[PDB]
Design an enzyme around this catalytic site. Structure first.
Site, PDB file in Angstrom:
ATOM      1  N   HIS A  61       0.829  -1.215   0.000  1.00  9.75           N
ATOM      2  CA  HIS A  61       0.000   0.000   0.000  1.00  9.75           C
ATOM      3  C   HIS A  61       0.874   1.281   0.000  1.00  9.75           C
ATOM      4  O   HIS A  61       0.563   2.268  -0.618  1.00  9.75           O
ATOM      5  CB  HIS A  61      -1.163   0.025   0.775  1.00  9.75           C
ATOM      6  CG  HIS A  61      -1.858  -1.299   0.914  1.00  9.75           C
ATOM      7  ND1 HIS A  61      -2.792  -1.751   0.003  1.00  9.75           N
ATOM      8  CD2 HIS A  61      -1.731  -2.279   1.840  1.00  9.75           C
ATOM      9  CE1 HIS A  61      -3.224  -2.943   0.376  1.00  9.75           C
ATOM     10  NE2 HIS A  61      -2.594  -3.287   1.485  1.00  9.75           N
ATOM     11  N   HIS A  91       4.952   6.952   6.893  1.00 11.95           N
ATOM     12  CA  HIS A  91       4.814   6.453   5.534  1.00 11.95           C
ATOM     13  C   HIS A  91       4.409   7.627   4.666  1.00 11.95           C
ATOM     14  O   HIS A  91       4.182   8.731   5.175  1.00 11.95           O
ATOM     15  CB  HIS A  91       3.757   5.353   5.446  1.00 11.95           C
ATOM     16  CG  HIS A  91       2.405   5.815   5.883  1.00 11.95           C
ATOM     17  ND1 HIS A  91       2.023   5.855   7.207  1.00 11.95           N
ATOM     18  CD2 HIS A  91       1.394   6.373   5.180  1.00 11.95           C
ATOM     19  CE1 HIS A  91       0.801   6.356   7.290  1.00 11.95           C
ATOM     20  NE2 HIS A  91       0.402   6.686   6.075  1.00 11.95           N
ATOM     21  N   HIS A  93       2.123   9.015   0.939  1.00 13.20           N
ATOM     22  CA  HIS A  93       1.155   8.866  -0.139  1.00 13.20           C
ATOM     23  C   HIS A  93       1.647   9.748  -1.275  1.00 13.20           C
ATOM     24  O   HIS A  93       2.046  10.886  -1.021  1.00 13.20           O
ATOM     25  CB  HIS A  93      -0.217   9.335   0.329  1.00 13.20           C
ATOM     26  CG  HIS A  93      -0.738   8.567   1.502  1.00 13.20           C
ATOM     27  ND1 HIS A  93      -1.360   7.343   1.370  1.00 13.20           N
ATOM     28  CD2 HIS A  93      -0.604   8.782   2.832  1.00 13.20           C
ATOM     29  CE1 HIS A  93      -1.694   6.899   2.570  1.00 13.20           C
ATOM     30  NE2 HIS A  93      -1.212   7.734   3.474  1.00 13.20           N
ATOM     31  N   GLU A 103      -3.215  13.506   0.208  1.00 12.77           N
ATOM     32  CA  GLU A 103      -4.541  13.101   0.651  1.00 12.77           C
ATOM     33  C   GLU A 103      -5.370  14.298   1.094  1.00 12.77           C
ATOM     34  O   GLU A 103      -6.453  14.542   0.555  1.00 12.77           O
ATOM     35  CB  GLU A 103      -4.420  12.042   1.750  1.00 12.77           C
ATOM     36  CG  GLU A 103      -3.984  10.755   1.102  1.00 12.77           C
ATOM     37  CD  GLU A 103      -4.052   9.542   1.985  1.00 12.77           C
ATOM     38  OE1 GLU A 103      -3.951   9.607   3.227  1.00 12.77           O
ATOM     39  OE2 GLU A 103      -4.446   8.512   1.398  1.00 12.77           O
ATOM     40  N   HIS A 116       2.915  11.057   6.577  1.00 16.53           N
ATOM     41  CA  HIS A 116       2.113  10.790   7.771  1.00 16.53           C
ATOM     42  C   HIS A 116       3.003  10.161   8.830  1.00 16.53           C
ATOM     43  O   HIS A 116       3.487   9.036   8.643  1.00 16.53           O
ATOM     44  CB  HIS A 116       0.945   9.854   7.447  1.00 16.53           C
ATOM     45  CG  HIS A 116      -0.100  10.490   6.581  1.00 16.53           C
ATOM     46  ND1 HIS A 116      -1.026   9.766   5.860  1.00 16.53           N
ATOM     47  CD2 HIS A 116      -0.389  11.793   6.361  1.00 16.53           C
ATOM     48  CE1 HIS A 116      -1.825  10.595   5.213  1.00 16.53           C
ATOM     49  NE2 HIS A 116      -1.473  11.830   5.511  1.00 16.53           N
ATOM     50  N   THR A 195      -6.792   6.850   6.837  1.00 12.87           N
ATOM     51  CA  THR A 195      -7.153   7.007   5.430  1.00 12.87           C
ATOM     52  C   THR A 195      -6.979   5.727   4.630  1.00 12.87           C
ATOM     53  O   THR A 195      -7.160   5.755   3.407  1.00 12.87           O
ATOM     54  CB  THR A 195      -6.321   8.089   4.744  1.00 12.87           C
ATOM     55  OG1 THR A 195      -4.966   7.662   4.691  1.00 12.87           O
ATOM     56  CG2 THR A 195      -6.428   9.427   5.491  1.00 12.87           C
ATOM     57  N   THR A 196      -6.580   4.631   5.270  1.00 11.18           N
ATOM     58  CA  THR A 196      -6.631   3.304   4.679  1.00 11.18           C
ATOM     59  C   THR A 196      -7.445   2.372   5.566  1.00 11.18           C
ATOM     60  O   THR A 196      -7.646   2.647   6.755  1.00 11.18           O
ATOM     61  CB  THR A 196      -5.226   2.719   4.462  1.00 11.18           C
ATOM     62  OG1 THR A 196      -4.489   2.743   5.693  1.00 11.18           O
ATOM     63  CG2 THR A 196      -4.484   3.491   3.396  1.00 11.18           C
TER      64      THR A 196
HETATM   65  C1  LIG Z   1       3.047  -4.166  14.883  1.00  9.41           C
HETATM   66  C2  LIG Z   1       3.649  -2.867  14.371  1.00  9.41           C
HETATM   67  C3  LIG Z   1       4.747  -2.302  14.995  1.00  9.41           C
HETATM   68  C4  LIG Z   1       5.276  -1.113  14.509  1.00  9.41           C
HETATM   69  C5  LIG Z   1       6.481  -0.460  15.177  1.00  9.41           C
HETATM   70  C6  LIG Z   1       4.701  -0.496  13.413  1.00  9.41           C
HETATM   71  C7  LIG Z   1       3.615  -1.088  12.788  1.00  9.41           C
HETATM   72  N1  LIG Z   1       3.038  -0.403  11.652  1.00  9.41           N
HETATM   73  C8  LIG Z   1       1.655  -0.015  11.788  1.00  9.41           C
HETATM   74  O1  LIG Z   1       1.097  -0.302  12.790  1.00  9.41           O
HETATM   75  N2  LIG Z   1       0.976   0.698  10.718  1.00  9.41           N
HETATM   76  C9  LIG Z   1      -0.414   1.115  10.776  1.00  9.41           C
HETATM   77  C10 LIG Z   1      -0.958   1.209  12.205  1.00  9.41           C
HETATM   78  S1  LIG Z   1      -2.737   1.336  12.000  1.00  9.41           S
HETATM   79  O2  LIG Z   1      -3.294   2.410  12.869  1.00  9.41           O
HETATM   80  O3  LIG Z   1      -3.444   0.123  12.466  1.00  9.41           O
HETATM   81  N3  LIG Z   1      -2.969   1.598  10.330  1.00  9.41           N
HETATM   82  C11 LIG Z   1      -2.944   2.959   9.796  1.00  9.41           C
HETATM   83  C12 LIG Z   1      -2.146   3.936  10.363  1.00  9.41           C
HETATM   84  C13 LIG Z   1      -2.135   5.206   9.824  1.00  9.41           C
HETATM   85  C14 LIG Z   1      -2.938   5.452   8.691  1.00  9.41           C
HETATM   86  S2  LIG Z   1      -3.003   7.066   7.914  1.00  9.41           S
HETATM   87  N4  LIG Z   1      -2.819   6.883   6.239  1.00  9.41           N
HETATM   88  O4  LIG Z   1      -4.322   7.677   8.195  1.00  9.41           O
HETATM   89  O5  LIG Z   1      -1.933   7.927   8.488  1.00  9.41           O
HETATM   90  C15 LIG Z   1      -3.736   4.462   8.133  1.00  9.41           C
HETATM   91  C16 LIG Z   1      -3.706   3.221   8.695  1.00  9.41           C
HETATM   92  C17 LIG Z   1       3.076  -2.267  13.266  1.00  9.41           C
HETATM   93 ZN   LIG Z   2      -1.228   7.778   5.542  1.00 10.45          ZN
END
Ligand SMILES: Cc1cc(C)cc(NC(=O)NCCS(=O)(=O)Nc2ccc(S(N)(=O)=O)cc2)c1
Ligand SMILES: [Zn+2]
Length: 257
Positions: A61, A91, A93, A103, A116, A195-196
């Site tokens: 993604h 990350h 976009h 976004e 982000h 946003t995902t």
């Molecule tokens: C298990 C572990 C450990 C460590 C260190 C990192 C990770 N990486 C991680 O958790 N990524 C996403 C967390 S989420 O909240 O569930 N998903 C999400 C977050 C932000 C946006 S956004 N595009 O709105 O900013 C959209 C979706 C995982």
């Molecule tokens: Zn994002």
């Protein structure tokens, strides 16, 4: 499974994630003539001096740099926020062309990309619990425009070759996220969502007014990544952005005049 193509993109997400049509979805257009200056808002506190980056990864993604969030090492505080939020990951976009990719938009203007920095509220103990709370996450959004190179981004850009396809990761220790910030911490803020998928409505958004500039060579390197995994038809990872969603019963506040 979800993505950004014709048949699995943002217009489809609501079928598996019906909160996509919810009351506080992100991103949104930031109308600078309707956002109200709020003098009660404090300065943001970005304390990244002790940040510990761990790995860089292509998740199909976007690409992400993860951090050790087992202690208060890199935290976001102040601004609209109550309590302490720990940096989990960042990350981006981005677009297939410089005229699109962000976004959030500003008076309908699209930037070339958007960073982000994702933080979670320590009073909930772990990220998974935080995503179930209306104040569980705080995401710091930073716009990218194409111009001069951003030196603090170059270490990211030079490792992308090594995580071209989904599922690939690499060691990416000792990266300083302070090198990605603009000079000013003036911001807009509003309550929103991821946003995902799962698009959970758990995010206090803090969107910085001042974009950072990145070079055309740096953003070209983003565009060489792939959505697919190794050994699958190559689909370039471009235009991995969700468009602006209805603002509905929300008000965007500005920290500046
Ligand atoms: C298990 C572990 C450990 C460590 C260190 C990192 C990770 N990486 C991680 O958790 N990524 C996403 C967390 S989420 O909240 O569930 N998903 C999400 C977050 C932000 C946006 S956004 N595009 O709105 O900013 C959209 C979706 C995982
Ligand atoms: Zn994002």
């Amino acid at each position: 499974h979800w993505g950004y193509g014709k048949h699995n993109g943002p217009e489809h997400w609501h079928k598996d994630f019906p909160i996509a049509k919810g009351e506080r979805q992100s991103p949104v257009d930031i109308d600078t003539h309707t956002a109200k200056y709020d003098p009660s808002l404090k300065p943001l506190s970005v304390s990244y001096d002790q940040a510990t980056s761990l790995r860089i990864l292509n998740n199909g993604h976007s690409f992400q740099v993860t951090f050790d969030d087992s202690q208060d090492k890199a935290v976001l505080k102040g601004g609209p926020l109550d309590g302490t939020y720990r940096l989990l990951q960042f990350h981006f976009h981005w677009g297939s062309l410089d005229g699109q990719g962000s976004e959030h938009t500003v008076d309908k203007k699209k930037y070339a990309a958007e960073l982000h920095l994702v933080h979670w509220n320590t009073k909930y103990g772990d990220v998974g619990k935080a995503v179930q709370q209306p104040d569980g996450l705080a995401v710091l959004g930073i716009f990218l425009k194409v111009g001069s190179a951003k030196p603090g981004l170059q270490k990211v850009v030079d490792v992308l070759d090594s995580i071209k396809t989904e599922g690939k990761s690499a060691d990416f220790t000792n990266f300083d996220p302070r090198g990605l910030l603009p000079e000013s911490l003036d911001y807009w803020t509003y309550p929103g969502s991821l946003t995902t998928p799962p698009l959970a409505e758990c995010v206090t958004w803090i969107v910085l007014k001042e974009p950072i500039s990145v070079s055309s060579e740096q953003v070209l390197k983003f565009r060489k990544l792939n959505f697919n995994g190794e050994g699958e038809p190559e689909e370039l990872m471009v235009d991995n952005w969700r468009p602006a969603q209805p603002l509905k019963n929300r008000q965007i506040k500005a920290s500046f005049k």
